């Protein structure tokens, strides 16, 4: 047969994205956070292009297409970063970009060490669970449809249909080589648990970037155009409970 769905995810997977960080300069909270913010701006461009190219994505109302991306970019970017860390330096450090690799010192200079530890842990989960490149791809796609407003989307039905189909695909990726039920059942359990763990991490980073935006001018931290807008219009909706993640387990 032909792995049509997987052929697609693989084909549309974004390439390498650098942050343009000056590693020849001593680490500073301002320089580091400003470099992460610009990396977010650059990655967002690739996330938009990636999403628009996902199977069925254009079925969503245009307003919803923008909404899911605006709400999920953090989890998506954190997830992809954890995988990069796992496969490049084996989770030893957080591989944000080839030119922005965090060691313990940078994790501390960034003033978000605790959040970094969790991201490093998630990164290790990729190794502990032996996540395959294909499971990573489908799990990441599912993360784009994992957070919605409690009041529902413009066209909620189309979204529900899309999310269901991506869960179905994740389910068949699990039953490719496995020919045992308790086996597939166990794997699905582990992955959904893994997907859920991304949410608390994104929440912390959402709170952290929000507070940073509010007083960025006082700490010399620069927020690019799209980042500043999304963080002050969309992120608050999340922090105030108007928009929530979809958890598999509670």
């Amino acid at each position: 047969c032909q792995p049509i769905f997987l052929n697609v995810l693989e084909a549309i997977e974004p390439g390498v994205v650098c942050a343009g960080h000056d590693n020849n300069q001593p680490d500073s909270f301002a320089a580091l956070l400003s470099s992460l913010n610009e990396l977010g701006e650059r990655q967002l461009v690739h996330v938009v292009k990636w999403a628009k190219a996902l199977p069925g994505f254009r079925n969503l109302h245009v307003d919803d297409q923008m909404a899911v991306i605006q709400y999920s970019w953090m989890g998506l970017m954190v997830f992809a970063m954890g995988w990069r860390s796992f496969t490049n330096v084996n989770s030893r450090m957080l591989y944000f970009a080839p030119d922005l690799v965090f060691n313990e010192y940078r994790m501390h200079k960034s003033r978000m060490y605790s959040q970094c530890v969790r991201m490093r842990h998630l990164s290790q989960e990729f190794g502990w669970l032996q996540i395959t490149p294909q499971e990573f791809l489908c799990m990441k796609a599912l993360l784009l449809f994992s957070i919605i407003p409690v009041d529902g989307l413009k066209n909620q039905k189309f979204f529900d249909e899309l999310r269901m189909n991506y869960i179905k695909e994740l389910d068949r990726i699990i039953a490719c080589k496995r020919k045992n039920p308790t086996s597939c059942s166990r794997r699905f359990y582990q992955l959904t648990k893994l997907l859920d763990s991304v949410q608390p991490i994104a929440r912390e980073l959402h709170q952290f970037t929000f507070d940073l935006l509010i007083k960025s001018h006082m700490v010399s931290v620069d927020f690019p155009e799209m980042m500043a807008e999304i963080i002050s219009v969309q992120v608050p909706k999340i922090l105030s409970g108007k928009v929530k993640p979809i958890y598999f387990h509670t």
């Binding site: 967002l44 628009k52 245009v62 923008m66 155009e225 799209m226 807008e229 999304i230």
Partner: peptide, 8 residues
């Protein structure tokens, strides 16, 4: 905005 221009 620039983000919106991506779908507009």
């Amino acid at each position: 905005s620039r983000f919106a221009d991506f779908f507009r």
